Ligand binder design. Structure first.
Ligand code: RZ7
Ligand code: ZN
Length: 257
């Protein structure tokens, strides 16, 4: 099925998922001179004090750090959102070199990677229901640039050796995702979609202006993961990002003046 190579990569996804050419696809380029400050944006509330991480999984496209979302522990509220969105997993998209890797771009600039903290709207009762609704998910997107190490990421990069190939997983309890946030919570927001098949148009995107810094050694370890399963020909998990899609009739709003 789909992937990131020449033969199954983003330019092909529309054949099995025609919504690939829809009216609210993600990611997009964020044109900093067109995005308008919206003084009506309520403030953002990231409540991760009670987050319970459970497991890390290589799913053959990225790795997901998964949380217990059986109850309202780690939630995202406020900003452009109505109601309460539960954290279910985070993952990253990254490149083969530092010059590309992010999905969103800023004035066409690609970052070395992008973190997605995925949350679902609890008024829909479960995640599978939430993905069918235009306000079903809220994805908090954080850019990564390469420079000084991020101390809160090191537990993640140290476990990657044990989930090298697709379908491998490891116990990953007690990880605190607050250690992946930047200082400022200033953000851009627009209505969009999942950036992997089935590309459902169910996401409120909230993309932080301030990137986090990670080290070269840190991102080099992301790039040693494999897209393939155990014992199959090795295909390094790199460039697992979808390029920017047409903005169409959408407004990107800024939380900051
Ligand atoms: N990169 S991103 O934008 O942050 C991003 C975030 C999360 C997902 C994600 O949960 N895909 C998984 C998925 F939702 F597609 C899903 F398989 F779980 C699903 F529920 F849709 C379903 F396919 F099961 C469906 F249709 F309901 F049957 C994808 C992209
Ligand atoms: Zn993602």
């Amino acid at each position: 099925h789909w992937g990131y190579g020449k033969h199954n990569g983003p330019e092909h996804w529309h054949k099995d998922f025609p919504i690939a050419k829809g009216e609210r696809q993600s990611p997009v380029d964020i044109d900093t001179h067109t995005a308008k400050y919206d003084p009506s944006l309520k403030p953002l509330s990231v409540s991760y004090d009670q987050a319970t991480s459970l497991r890390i999984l290589n799913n053959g496209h990225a790795f997901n750090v998964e949380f217990d979302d059986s109850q309202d522990k780690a939630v995202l509220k406020g900003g452009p959102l109505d109601g309460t969105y539960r954290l279910i997993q985070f993952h990253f998209h990254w490149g083969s070199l530092d010059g590309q890797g992010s999905e969103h771009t800023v004035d066409k600039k690609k970052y070395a990677a992008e973190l997605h903290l995925v949350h679902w709207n609890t008024k829909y009762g479960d995640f599978g229901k939430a993905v069918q609704q235009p306000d079903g998910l809220a994805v908090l997107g954080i850019f990564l640039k390469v420079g000084s190490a991020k101390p809160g990421l090191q537990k993640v990069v140290d476990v990657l050796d044990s989930i090298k190939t697709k379908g491998k997983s490891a116990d990953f309890t007690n990880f605190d995702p607050r250690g992946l946030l930047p200082e400022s919570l200033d953000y851009w927001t627009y209505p969009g979609s999942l950036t992997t098949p089935p590309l459902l148009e169910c996401v409120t995107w909230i993309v932080l202006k301030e990137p986090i810094s990670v080290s070269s050694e840190q991102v080099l370890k992301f790039r040693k993961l494999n897209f393939n399963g155990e014992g199959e020909p090795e295909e390094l998990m790199v460039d697992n990002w979808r390029p920017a899609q047409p903005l169409k009739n959408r407004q990107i709003k800024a939380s900051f003046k």
